Design a protein around this ligand. Structure first.
Ligand code: 3KD
Ligand code: MG
Ligand code: MG
Ligand code: MG
Ligand code: MG
Ligand code: MG
Ligand code: MG
Ligand code: MG
Ligand code: MG
Ligand code: MG
Ligand code: MG
Ligand code: MG
Ligand code: MG
Ligand code: MG
Ligand code: MG
Ligand code: MG
Ligand code: MG
Ligand code: MG
Ligand code: MG
Ligand code: MG
Ligand code: MG
Ligand code: MG
Ligand code: MG
Ligand code: MG
Ligand code: MG
Ligand code: MG
Ligand code: MG
Ligand code: MG
Ligand code: MG
Ligand code: MG
Ligand code: MG
Ligand code: MG
Ligand code: MG
Ligand code: MG
Ligand code: MG
Ligand code: MG
Ligand code: MG
Ligand code: MG
Ligand code: MG
Ligand code: MG
Ligand code: MG
Ligand code: MG
Ligand code: MG
Ligand code: MG
Ligand code: MG
Ligand code: MG
Ligand code: MG
Ligand code: MG
Ligand code: MG
Ligand code: MG
Ligand code: MG
Ligand code: MG
Ligand code: MG
Ligand code: MG
Ligand code: MG
Ligand code: MG
Ligand code: MG
Ligand code: MG
Ligand code: MG
Ligand code: MG
Ligand code: MG
Ligand code: MG
Lengths: 48, 177, 98, 136, 48
RNA sequence: GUGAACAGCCUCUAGUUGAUAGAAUAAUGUAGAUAAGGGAAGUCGGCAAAAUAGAUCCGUAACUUCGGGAUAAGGAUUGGC
RNA sequence: GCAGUCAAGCGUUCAUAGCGACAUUGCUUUUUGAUUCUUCGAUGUCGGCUCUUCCUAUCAUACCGAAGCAGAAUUCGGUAA
RNA sequence: GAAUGUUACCGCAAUAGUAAUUGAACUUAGUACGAGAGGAACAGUUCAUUCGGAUAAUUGGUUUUUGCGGCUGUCUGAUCAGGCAUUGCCGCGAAGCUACCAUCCGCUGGAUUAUGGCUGAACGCCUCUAAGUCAGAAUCCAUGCUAGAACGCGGUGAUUUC
RNA sequence: UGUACAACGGGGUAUUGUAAGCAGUAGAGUAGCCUUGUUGUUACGAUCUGCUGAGAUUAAGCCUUUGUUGUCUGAUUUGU
């Protein structure tokens, strides 16, 4: 907990996210979800 | 964004306004021609199916079926083509055009009703506007009544009344062919 | 928040992702990553690069069900007649015979 | 920046240190601009001052009309090529370095700007806004 | 845990990016309920 | 074998496989590399480094003791089948 | 090199806002001299690069007093390294 | 890192260090002042510089991931698959490391100086000063921040039997 | 001796850019036999196409796991 009550404007601003990235951090991720990836890729040699 | 809806069965039209990204979001990434179920856009239109027919972005440039893209481009346009009326024999003008894929930049989405959902939309289903003109060519009267080349048209031509204040008149076409 | 696409490869560029190249003629080229970006700088031709959309589109790879039929049609038949001309005496005179 | 720069400018990656030569993208007669200083930039042992989009530099015309050569005039930077990043998250870069010669108040010497212009420059200097075609 | 990216609108009347989206990096820390196992009382002394 | 080649690189014959060894891979080194944007602003000074390069064709200034300058400069080309 | 005291003048008028002659009392030791005390069985006897710290006789920045300070700008001075 | 019973956990804080800096724009305001020419500032806001401490989602750099692919010369009868060329060469390249080339963060109380004052004698008057006293600076002391005295210290756990 | 630990295996995630093999009416073309072609036939041909966004690699400081396999008391020292 901060040791003072900042007025700042910068503090006080009441954020609200629109979108939180969720693509892989282990590479140049392209897809938020498996659902998204499945959507865009089409059907693969594994799969159904 | 503004929705311009037509019910091509009554010849109705009325515009609707929708200020809700989520309620809008349905039409995004949809092209011209793709069908769109209704309930997503409101509760009024539950079931109602919409065909997407075009629209204008802010700046007013029009969509053009089959460009794909959800952006603007500048095309060469010719005779017999949308978003262009040639001013001179064999003239083509190079004009900006908006894509056929719906984005949040559209000021207006043009829409057509294809199936009427479970409820009535006021200025649309409830009102029905008559077809201005009637059949003028010979066989066309014969087909807008189904008559066989026996029945004689001259009395099946349509007749539109009008008044001159105290003279009520009558004027039928001029059957060609 | 618009997701963009890669103008070499065709992948979705979610936000803050990859680079953006404003070419001399003001044509703009959005890349999702340094791969497309270098192939692109290398005057490589996306149609010859297997993993690209543009490739696959032109080689008809795994589209399968988009060329499969559908069910999108209507059924009307509503009389309106002709304005000024009695839309009343235009269905009773429309009894036909054949 | 400074004089005639109405507005502020969020920091953008310095791309042209002193000695850089940018294409001159107006119609004044000048073909290139040789950067000799950067306006409103500070001091550090051995740091070269460096300009970025929408910066005012002092320059000379190394290759241009003779009436534009052998003298120091102001200029404004309009295209980068060193990748910078906007607050909307995008790293972008032009294909060349390019500014246009201007007076201290930030008025153009010539009357067209040939080529695209970065928005962060258009925003910054009005008469540069005017003479633009494609911005960004 | 790590970091991801965020997109949100900015509320900063005066800024060029007022009412425009910004993209911002964030860190995430894993935060399962702490459990209380004791209290400890301190007193003031002239040695602290 | 490649290639203009007694070059470099790989091979046959022959001959070696000697050079304290193990475990780690901190700073600083020695030797080998790369680096966005800028391009000598560094420095006594471009020191170091980078750039260039083979061949075939096209093209080639000043000046000169007429022999040269000259691979001047500047360009295109080059695989496989 | 730096800082004073006297105050004849300078400053339209007005010694001392800002200055200041003839004189005169000082401080400093990045000047140069004077000396020759230490080192001649050797204290690496230009400058730059780097990097720390210290002085203040303060260029900037904080807060002040003063003006021949209307404003703007400037100048003199204090506390200040 | 030996020795202050052993061992473990949680803490205190002496002393020492300490840090932030400067500019501009908008607005005030074409306002105060001025015949005119010109022409400010406090409050508010947005950015910046120089400095510092981190950090690696993003972008960029790095490449023995010798990871995938490509190429020359040769050697393994060919094929598959490979060896060698002080890491043979080239394109991409994850992870790590990393950059004002990238992002994020850099605290608020008091006491004071100069100075302007209060009350006020000395000196019936007068004086900020003698007693007493108010306001006050990039100063100082704290707050915060970094060590933690290996001879400063507290609380607490468990403490060996063949 | 248990939401134990490890070695493999699996699944995710990632990197490359389409494996080997086979097939083909793709292929500038080329030989060979005759029964000299109203696709004559048998092969060969850089490359191309299909099975095939395949194959390979993927923690060595990525994520994960109902499977498989194994491991689970050696040493030394300390007391107010
Ligand atoms: O050592 C001697 C001096 C010296 C003698 C030299 C020499 C250098 C020096 C250095 N000087 C500094 C002070 C010194 C004092 C002494 O006199 C030295 O180079 C050759 O001889
Ligand atoms: Mg006719
Ligand atoms: Mg790269
Ligand atoms: Mg990279
Ligand atoms: Mg030009
Ligand atoms: Mg220097
Ligand atoms: Mg010349
Ligand atoms: Mg104009
Ligand atoms: Mg021998
Ligand atoms: Mg030896
Ligand atoms: Mg060894
Ligand atoms: Mg290691
Ligand atoms: Mg470089
Ligand atoms: Mg150059
Ligand atoms: Mg120099
Ligand atoms: Mg030069
Ligand atoms: Mg120098
Ligand atoms: Mg020299
Ligand atoms: Mg020199
Ligand atoms: Mg050299
Ligand atoms: Mg190079
Ligand atoms: Mg020569
Ligand atoms: Mg020569
Ligand atoms: Mg050829
Ligand atoms: Mg006198
Ligand atoms: Mg006077
Ligand atoms: Mg006088
Ligand atoms: Mg001196
Ligand atoms: Mg000596
Ligand atoms: Mg001696
Ligand atoms: Mg010495
Ligand atoms: Mg010596
Ligand atoms: Mg002192
Ligand atoms: Mg002083
Ligand atoms: Mg006066
Ligand atoms: Mg004072
Ligand atoms: Mg200091
Ligand atoms: Mg001190
Ligand atoms: Mg001990
Ligand atoms: Mg004992
Ligand atoms: Mg104004
Ligand atoms: Mg006046
Ligand atoms: Mg390889
Ligand atoms: Mg084979
Ligand atoms: Mg060998
Ligand atoms: Mg060798
Ligand atoms: Mg990396
Ligand atoms: Mg920094
Ligand atoms: Mg702090
Ligand atoms: Mg205190
Ligand atoms: Mg008083
Ligand atoms: Mg006082
Ligand atoms: Mg006192
Ligand atoms: Mg007194
Ligand atoms: Mg007090
Ligand atoms: Mg301070
Ligand atoms: Mg505090
Ligand atoms: Mg201790
Ligand atoms: Mg203790
Ligand atoms: Mg095991
Ligand atoms: Mg394939
Ligand atoms: Mg298994």
């Amino acid at each position: 907990k901060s040791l003072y009550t900042n007025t700042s404007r910068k503090a006080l601003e009441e954020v609200s996210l629109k979108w939180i990235d969720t693509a892989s951090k282990f590479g140049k991720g392209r897809f938020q979800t498996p659902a998204e990836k499945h959507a865009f890729m089409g059907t693969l040699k594994k799969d159904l | 964004m503004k929705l311009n809806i037509s019910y091509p069965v009554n010849g109705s039209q009325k515009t609707f306004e929708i200020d809700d990204e989520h309620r809008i979001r349905v039409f995004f990434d949809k092209r011209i021609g793709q069908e769109v179920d209704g309930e997503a856009v409101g509760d009024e239109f539950k079931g109602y199916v919409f065909k997407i027919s075009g629209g204008n972005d802010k700046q007013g440039f029009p969509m053009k079926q089959g460009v794909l893209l959800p952006t603007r481009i500048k095309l060469l346009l010719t005779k017999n083509v949308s978003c262009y009326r040639p001013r001179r024999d064999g003239e083509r003008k190079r004009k900006s055009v908006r894509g056929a894929i719906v984005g949040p930049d559209l000021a207006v989405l043009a829409l057509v009703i294809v199936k009427k959902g479970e409820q009535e939309l006021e200025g649309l289903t409830d009102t029905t506007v008559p077809k201005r003109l009637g059949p003028k060519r010979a066989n066309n009267i014969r087909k807008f009544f189904g008559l066989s080349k026996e029945d004689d048209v001259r009395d099946f031509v349509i007749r539109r009344e009008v008044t001159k204040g105290e003279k009520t008149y009558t004027k039928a076409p001029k059957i060609q062919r | 928040m618009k997701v963009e696409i890669d103008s070499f490869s065709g992948a979705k560029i979610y936000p803050g992702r990859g680079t953006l190249f404003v070419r001399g003629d003001s044509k703009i080229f959005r890349f999702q990553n340094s791969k497309s970006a270098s192939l692109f700088k290398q005057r490589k031709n996306p149609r010859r690069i297997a993993w690209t959309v543009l490739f696959r589109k032109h080689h008809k790879k795994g589209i399968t069900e988009e060329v499969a039929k559908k069910r999108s049609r209507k059924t009307v038949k509503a009389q309106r007649p002709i304005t000024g001309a009695s839309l009343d005496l235009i269905k009773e005179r429309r009894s036909l015979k054949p | 920046s400074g004089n005639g720069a109405q507005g502020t400018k969020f920091r953008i990656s310095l791309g042209l240190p002193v000695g850089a030569i940018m294409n001159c993208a107006d119609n004044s007669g000048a073909r290139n601009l040789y950067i000799i200083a950067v306006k409103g930039s500070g001091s550090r042992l051995n740091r070269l001052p460096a300009a970025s989009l929408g910066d005012m530099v002092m320059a000379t015309v190394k290759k241009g009309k003779p009436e534009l050569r052998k003298k120091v005039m102001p200029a404004i930077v309009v295209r980068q090529a060193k990748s910078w990043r906007r607050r909307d998250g995008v790293f972008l870069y032009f294909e060349d370095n390019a500014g246009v010669i201007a007076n201290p108040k930030g008025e153009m010497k010539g009357s067209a700007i040939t080529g695209p212009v970065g928005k962060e420059c258009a925003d910054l200097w009005p008469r540069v806004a005017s003479n633009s075609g494609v911005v960004v | 845990a790590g970091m991801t990216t965020i997109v949100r609108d900015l509320d900063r009347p005066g800024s060029k990016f007022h009412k425009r989206e910004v993209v911002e990096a964030v860190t995430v820390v894993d935060t399962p309920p702490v459990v209380v196992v004791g209290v400890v009382g301190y007193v003031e002394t002239p040695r602290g």
